[PDB]
Design a protein around this ligand. Structure first.
Ligand SMILES: COc1ccc(C2(c3ccc(OC)cc3)c3cc(O)ccc3-c3ccc(C=O)c(C#Cc4ccc(O)cc4)c32)cc1
Ligand SMILES: [Mg+2]
Ligand SMILES: [Zn+2]
Length: 334
């Protein structure tokens, strides 16, 4: 892209938008257009520089870029929601959640690295259909993974596998112990993004909130791996379920996209003679009521608990969610 050092018309604008990377409600769709459909690459790269991770872990810049481009390529450009823009968004959302005052200096550089990396790979090579669809159609993926966290195991396998491609091992200068530790954390995190685990994960988070302990500066105290990994699992899970907490213009576009992917699964189901899964029937749809339902029973309970953990750091995020819930409610057709 560059031309004799000084920046292009677009590059300048992209660079301007990337100044918002520490903010909730980054214009992630603008960044995707401006970057030539490379939101994951430029946002990861920007975040790594901001956190000084290339120096801390001796990551060569060219290896980082080469890996990010290869990883981004393996998200499907023809899947409406579970694509590279989603991955970029979850990465950036996790990045902001990591900077919350209630967790200052709680996580090591390595844990910070695991959470961002996990976020980047968390839906890679998603085919645009659910675990239950993959199980019900007796797919190769479901067969490989024995019906258990089918997609999530696959996102991990592809994520780690791509590190072994030419000039792609972004972790080449980590010690053996660091590589082990990072690999384990990443697996624990991504496996917890499986939506069938939400209830168990939320219930454990609640327990932690009720028995919450903080240090002599309001900062959250975490004694052991169990508690540390649990917070990172919920953090990334929250980032994954962050669309309803973003400014409405971002939220609506996320909803438009997920409904398209869902409807596309339902058509495929209908062509095979199967029952149409919840949310996937374009002839029996209720988009607004469904978003209200998803917020009340799933997203709000999660983010409310997260907000308690980090109180009051996440109040604005919770207020936007509530406002967006009010708005969708108000639209429900009579
Ligand atoms: C095609 O695959 C799908 C589609 C939808 C869902 C749902 C859902 C409900 C609860 C969940 O637990 C936290 C997760 C998903 C679901 C199940 C159900 O029995 C009734 C309503 C909804 C419902 C309503 C709105 C929504 C979203 O607005 C969802 C969902 C979802 C979803 C799935 C995967 C992702 O990576 C991100 C988001 C779901 C699940 C799988
Ligand atoms: Mg997923
Ligand atoms: Zn996701």
């Amino acid at each position: 892209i560059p031309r004799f050092g000084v920046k292009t018309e677009q590059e300048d604008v992209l660079a301007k938008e990337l100044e918002d990377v520490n903010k909730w409600g980054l214009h992630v769709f603008r960044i995707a257009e401006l970057s030539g459909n490379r939101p994951l690459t430029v946002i990861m790269h920007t975040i790594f520089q901001e956190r000084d991770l290339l120096k801390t872990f001796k990551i060569p810049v060219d290896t980082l870029i080469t890996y990010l481009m290869t990883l981004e390529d393996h998200y499907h450009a023809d899947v409406a929601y579970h694509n590279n823009i989603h991955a970029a968004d979850v990465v950036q959302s996790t990045h902001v959640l990591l900077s919350t005052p209630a967790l200052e200096a709680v996580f090591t550089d390595l844990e910070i690295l695991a959470a961002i990396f996990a976020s980047a790979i968390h839906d890679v090579d998603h085919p645009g259909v659910s675990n239950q669809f993959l199980i019900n159609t007796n797919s190769e993926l479901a067969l490989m993974y024995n019906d258990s966290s089918v997609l999530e195991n696959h996102h991990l396998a592809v994520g780690f596998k791509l590190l072994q491609e030419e000039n792609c091992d972004i972790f080449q200068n980590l010690t053996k112990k660091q590589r082990q530790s990072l690999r384990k954390m990443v697996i624990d995190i991504v496996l917890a993004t499986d939506m069938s685990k939400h209830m168990n994960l939320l219930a454990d988070l609640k327990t932690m909130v009720e028995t919450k302990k903080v240090t002599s500066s309001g900062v959250l105290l975490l004694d052991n791996y169990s508690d540390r990994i649990q917070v990172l699992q919920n953090m990334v899970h929250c980032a994954d379920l962050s669309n309803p907490t973003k400014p409405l213009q971002l939220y609506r576009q996320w909803t438009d996209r997920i409904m398209e992917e869902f409807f596309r699964q339902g058509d495929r189901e209908r062509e095979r003679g199967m029952e149409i899964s919840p949310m996937c029937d374009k002839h029996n749809a209720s988009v607004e009521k469904s978003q209200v339902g998803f917020i009340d029973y799933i997203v709000h309970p999660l983010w409310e608990t997260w907000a308690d953990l980090v109180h009051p750091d996440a109040q604005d995020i919770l207020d936007t969610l509530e406002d967006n819930r009010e708005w969708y409610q108000s639209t429900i057709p009579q």
